[PDB]
DNA sequence: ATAACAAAAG
DNA sequence: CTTTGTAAAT
């Protein structure tokens, strides 16, 4: 079920997916909420990667950016819908990606 | 105004 | 072995 794939090649797939989220974020820029293109979680020399998955409200207070987690579903009804990203596991280890397909 | 973590929950 | 929060680079 799981696939280990070299870095430069799967980065092409990753950058395509992140591009969809960049373009979506410009479309909803006046809704005030942020769909994070690329989220990394670190454990045990692995990086777990979640593309276009988690919504935040960004506030800037006192110079400093603040991240308010909103969730996985789009936070305002009737706003444009986020792009279909594959949900599947992405793990970076040792300049390679473990992926599902 | 997009790119290094922890712990809880799954 | 994902979900929910915390906090330089472009």
Residue numbers in the entry: 4 to 104
Question: What did the article's authors report about this structure?
Answer:
We identify a hitherto uncharacterized protein factor that we term UBP (ucm-binding protein) that interacts sequence-specifically with the ucm and determine the structure of the protein both in isolation and when bound to DNA. UBP is a highly abundant protein, and we reveal that it plays a role akin to bacterial nucleoid-associated proteins with over 300 binding sites on the Sulfolobus chromosome. Importantly, UBP interacts with the N-terminal domains of MCM. Taken together, our data provide evidence that UBP functions as a general nucleoid-associated protein that plays a key role in facilitating the egress of the MCM replicative helicase from DNA replication origins.
Next, we solved the structure of UBP bound to DNA containing a ucm site to 1.8 Å resolution. We attempted crystallization with a range of sizes of DNA molecule; the only construct that yielded crystal formation was a 12 nt duplex DNA. Significantly, and in contrast to the homodimeric free protein, UBP binds DNA as a monomer. The interaction with DNA is principally via the major groove and is mediated by two sets of beta-hairpins within the structure, one corresponding to the stirrup loops in the free protein and the other being a part of the 5-beta-strand sheet to which the C-terminal beta strand contributes. Of the three lysine residues in the stirrup loop, K63 makes base-specific contacts in the protein-DNA co-crystal structure. The DNA structure remains close to standard B-form but with a widening of the minor groove to 8 Å at the center of the molecule. Notably, the beta-strand that undergoes the intermonomer strand swap in the DNA-free dimer is now observed to fold back to form an analogous interaction in cis. Furthermore, the interprotomer Y100—F13 π-stacking interaction switches from an offset sandwich orientation in the dimer to a T-shaped interaction in the snapped-back cis configuration of the C-terminal beta strand in the DNA-bound monomer. In contrast to IHF and Fis, although a modest widening of the minor groove is seen, UBP does not introduce any discernible bending of DNA in our protein-DNA co-crystal structure. However, our demonstration that UBP binds the ucm as a monomer suggests this is not the case.
